[PDB]
Amino acid sequence: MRSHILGKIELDQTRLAPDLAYLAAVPTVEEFSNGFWKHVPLWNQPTAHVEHVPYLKEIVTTVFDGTHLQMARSRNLKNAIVIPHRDFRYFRTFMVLEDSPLAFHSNEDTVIHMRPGEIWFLDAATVHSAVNFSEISRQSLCVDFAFDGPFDEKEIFADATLYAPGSTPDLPERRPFTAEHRRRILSLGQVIERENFRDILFLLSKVHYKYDVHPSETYDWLIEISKQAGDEKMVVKAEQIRDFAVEARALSERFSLTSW
Amino acid sequence: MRSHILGKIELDQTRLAPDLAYLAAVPTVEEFSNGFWKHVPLWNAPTAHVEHVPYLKEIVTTVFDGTHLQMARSRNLKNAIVIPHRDFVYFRTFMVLEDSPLAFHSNEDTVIHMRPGEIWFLDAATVHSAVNFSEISRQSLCVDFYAPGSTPDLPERRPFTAEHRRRILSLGQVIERENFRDILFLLSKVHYKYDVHPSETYDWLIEISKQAGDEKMVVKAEQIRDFAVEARALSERFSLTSW
Ligand SMILES: [Fe+2]
Numbered sequence: 001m002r003s004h005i006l007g008k009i010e011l012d013q014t015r016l017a018p019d020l021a022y023l024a025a026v027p028t029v030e031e032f033s034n035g036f037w038k039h040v041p042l043w044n045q046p047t048a049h050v051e052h053v054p055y056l057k058e059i060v061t062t063v064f065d066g067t068h069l070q071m072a073r074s075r076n077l078k079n080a081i082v083i084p085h086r087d088f089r090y091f092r093t094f095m096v097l098e099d100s101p102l103a104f105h106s107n108e109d110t111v112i113h114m115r116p117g118e119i120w121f122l123d124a125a126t127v128h129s130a131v132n133f134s135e136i137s138r139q140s141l142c143v144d145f146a147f148d149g150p151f152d153e154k155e156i157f158a159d160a161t162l163y164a165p166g167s168t169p170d171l172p173e174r175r176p177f178t179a180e181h182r183r184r185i186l187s188l189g190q191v192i193e194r195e196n197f198r199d200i201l202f203l204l205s206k207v208h209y210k211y212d213v214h215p216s217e218t219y220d221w222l223i224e225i226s227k228q229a230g231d232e233k234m235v236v237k238a239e240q241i242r243d244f245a246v247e248a249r250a251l252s253e254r255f256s257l258t259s260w
Numbered sequence: 261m262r263s264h265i266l267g268k269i270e271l272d273q274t275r276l277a278p279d280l281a282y283l284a285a286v287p288t289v290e291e292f293s294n295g296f297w298k299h300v301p302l303w304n305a306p307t308a309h310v311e312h313v314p315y316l317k318e319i320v321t322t323v324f325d326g327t328h329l330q331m332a333r334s335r336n337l338k339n340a341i342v343i344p345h346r347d348f349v350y351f352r353t354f355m356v357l358e359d360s361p362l363a364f365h366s367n368e369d370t371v372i373h374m375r376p377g378e379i380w381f382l383d384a385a386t387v388h389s390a391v392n393f394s395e396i397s398r399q400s401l402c403v404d405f406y407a408p409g410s411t412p413d414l415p416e417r418r419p420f421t422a423e424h425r426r427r428i429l430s431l432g433q434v435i436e437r438e439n440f441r442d443i444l445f446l447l448s449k450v451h452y453k454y455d456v457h458p459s460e461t462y463d464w465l466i467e468i469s470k471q472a473g474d475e476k477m478v479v480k481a482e483q484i485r486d487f488a489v490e491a492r493a494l495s496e497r498f499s500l501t502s503w
């Protein structure tokens with residue numbers, strides 16, 4: 001199902017500053033990851049954190065519910081990109097808590113800029129990605145819901161007035177993706193090496209946020225760049241990464257992005 | 261006392277709530293110390309912490325002149341007591357950031373109750389102590405490198421009599437090697453409430469140890485008094501738990 005705003009609660013800045021202070025300092029425990037990302041599980045039965053610097057506690061308790069919501073966590077990301085990929089009826093809500101301008105999300109053909117307070121529905125089964133082109137903080141609250149007991153996206157709210165499904169979204173404009181531009185991306189066939197394969201993967205993954213092209217093409221480009229490079233082991237690895245990212249196809253155990 | 265107020269500043273208890281929340285959750289990890297204490301390095305002679313503490317950062321930046329700013333950190337203390345000592349035989353200022361009613365500092369012959377925002381100078385050369393008789397947070401900004409006549413809260417202590425001294429030496433009937441430390445910390449607290457020089461803590465401990473008839477206790481007490489009152493260094497073989 002396509003991504004869309006479910007509603008939009010207003011956020012009490014000062015009442016919420018100390019909660020972000022906490023979350024930023026909580027240490028939590030320690031692949032295809034880059035940059036800074038971080039999670040603080042809030043619901044999993046609460047956690048030692050809930051009580052710790054509240055407010056969000058209120059929100060997830062005053063805004064949502066129903067006998068089932070199987071999760072909840074903070075989720076920050078600075079100067080990072082998570083490559084496009086599908087995770088595999090498992091609802092999932094996302095709410096950014098602060099103003100981070102160069103922070104975006106993508107899902108199949110769309111690119112969105114979440115604003116403070118909006119509650120978005122995101123689908124796990126589709127090809128998605130997230131990014132932060134800058135170091136400005138982007139703390140978010142994420143709440144997943146449990147179903148297969150037939151629903152209406154309204155019934156995730158404990159109070160149905162919060163539900164406002166028509167708020168318009170910030171959909172960034174993207175430049176047309178020309179054929180000249182595709183050929184230039186293929187020019188990386190000249191410079192890709194096994195020691196920078198991973199770096200190129202991350203670079204290609206960024207293109208769709210600015211240009212009008214499906215993000216799954218990231219993988220087609222990488223495979224072609226690989227063939228242009230004449231490196232057979234690279235071609236094979238770029239094909240496995242693509243089968244893993246858009247096909248959920250399990251990657252071998254011992255599979256390594258940096259040991260060919 | 262050689263310590264005194266250096267001029268207040270009133271804290272914006274709203275830009276400060278989040279910083280306090282930051283300082284309280286960060287991991288930091290860390291002999292005569294007991295209870296709860298935690299320090300957050302801010303400026304060493306600047307850290308990943310400074311920018312997540314916007315307001316605190318503003319204050320050390322503009323209220324202070326770095327033309328000799330050695331360093332600054334945050335120091336918290338709950339149900340804790342720093343035994344009275346003199347550091348040796350620089351310039352330290354201290355600013356409590358929260359109202360913790362049962363948190364006190366003492367120096368030579370007076371006891372102080374720092375109120376939020378005041379900027380104090382604490383002398384390291386004379387016998388000093390700090391304590392928090394409760395759990396109420398007492399987050400403080402310590403900056404090591406203007407209104408002096410400001411009136412400080414200098415609690416008024418009760419008279420320390422010979423009768424009280426005697427009750428105190430009754431501890432000689434219960435001291436044991438396993439509660440020696442506890443009694444040290446208990447004794448260290450008397451001067452906050454009673455008008456008696458903090459150093460006398462060590463004289464009671466020594467007199468208590470002698471009445472106990474435990475020579476290893478007497479020698480230990482002497483070592484603590486020399487370390488605390490005379491700044492003599494203890495061995496690395498020294499311990500309050502290993503006899
Ligand atoms: Fe995912």
Ligand SMILES: [Fe+2]
Pocket residue numbers: 345346347384388
């Ligand atoms: Fe000291």
